[PDB]
Design a protein around this ligand. Structure first.
Ligand SMILES: *[C@@H]1O[C@H](CO)[C@@H](O[C@@H]2O[C@H](CO)[C@@H](O)[C@H](O)[C@H]2NC(C)=O)[C@H](O)[C@H]1NC(C)=O
Lengths: 106, 228
């Protein structure tokens, strides 16, 4: 019945609308605007930095995603980071990961 | 005796893709041996002109000429001089014409709720303002199918009272009042010379409008960060 308008995974905002069919009444149908927002709560500011301060201002511009730092992560997108480790005397720079089951090469 | 040469309009370029200039030599005496000729400023002629007109009921002869040119040969600034000859004019009269930007803005205005209370008919108005120059063609389509020419009429261009160098155009499409049960898409497509693709299609259905109910179901969880 309803169709999906916006399914962006950056801000994790789901925008959709549905028309409700009433009884045999005049043309006074009610139009709705379904919005789904998931608060990250326990997440960092930068996308590739786990030492960022905890989020405090959750600003969501509804007029900007219907035409950029993303709070929520993506299951189908891999996130990598580099941290300087030693493990002895040589300072190597390996590539790390942020989310499980999302960075396995094909 | 009147001589007028109407320049080709933009409506015949986006749809027919064949520009043509014609000079009217109507309201003249009823005599034969009338030849239509176009003289350019560089020394080139035009193609064969056929399909002449008949005589008016008021005992005046009418003629029509054809001159097929290219689109690039009109916007550069080439001037065409149409010259004709007759018996009453010792000298061949000549009439020369020539052509003397901002991105267009398209807005669709849904009908008010007072019109739908009568349960008689509904009108859809697509407001197009803030564009230059004038003479813009506006057409309506239904799911990719153009409608009848007599179903919609494009208003004549009018200078904007506020903007010193912009114009606005209006276009209405009256349909049945009960047609809103589905929507029939009812896009608004305009063609202007100040666009790369010259295609601006906007759709406003029943669902797309001013909703009267909002329920932002927001949730908070400690393990958030996946967005299933
Ligand atoms: C903070 O975020 C910025 C992006 O807005 C990061 O800058 C780039 O991040 C990508 C992420 O993989 C790296 O591949 C680039 O090399 C970064 N570019 C630069 C110029 O740094 C930035 O790295 C983030 N901060 C930290 C500490 O990771």
């Amino acid at each position: 019945e309803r169709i999906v308008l916006v399914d962006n995974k950056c801000k994790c905002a789901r925008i959709t609308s549905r028309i409700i069919r009433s009884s045999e009444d005049p043309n006074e149908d009610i139009v709705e605007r379904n919005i789904r927002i998931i608060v990250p709560l326990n997440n960092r500011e930068n996308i590739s930095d786990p030492t960022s301060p905890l989020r405090t201002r959750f600003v969501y511009h509804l007029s900007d995603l219907c035409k950029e730092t993303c709070y929520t992560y993506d299951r189908n997108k891999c996130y990598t980071a580099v941290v300087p480790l030693v493990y002895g005397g040589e300072t190597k720079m390996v590539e790390t990961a942020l989310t499980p089951d999302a960075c396995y090469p094909d | 005796i009147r001589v007028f040469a109407i320049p080709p309009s933009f409506a015949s370029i986006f749809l027919t893709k064949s520009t043509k200039l014609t000079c009217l030599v109507t309201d003249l005496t009823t005599y034969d041996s009338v030849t239509i000729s176009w003289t350019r400023q560089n020394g080139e002629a035009v193609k064969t002109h056929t399909n002449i007109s008949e005589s008016h009921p008021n005992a005046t002869f009418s003629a029509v000429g054809e001159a097929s040119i290219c689109e690039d040969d009109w916007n550069s600034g080439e001037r065409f001089t149409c010259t004709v000859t007759h018996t009453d004019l010792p000298s061949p009269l000549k009439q020369t014409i020539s052509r003397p930007l901002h991105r267009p803005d398209v807005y669709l205005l849904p009908p008010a709720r007072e019109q739908l209370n009568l349960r008689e008919s509904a009108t859809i108005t697509c407001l197009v303002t803030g564009f230059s120059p004038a003479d813009v063609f506006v057409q309506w389509m239904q799911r990719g199918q153009p409608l009848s020419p007599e179903k919609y009429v494009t208003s004549a261009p009018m200078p904007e009272p506020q903007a010193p160098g912009r114009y606005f155009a209006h276009s209405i499409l009256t349909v049945s009042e009960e047609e809103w049960n589905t929507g029939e898409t009812y896009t608004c497509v305009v063609a202007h010379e100040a666009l790369p693709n010259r295609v601006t299609e906007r759709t406003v259905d029943k669902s797309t409008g001013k909703p009267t109910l909002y329920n932002v179901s927001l949730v908070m969880s400690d393990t958030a960060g996946t967005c299933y």
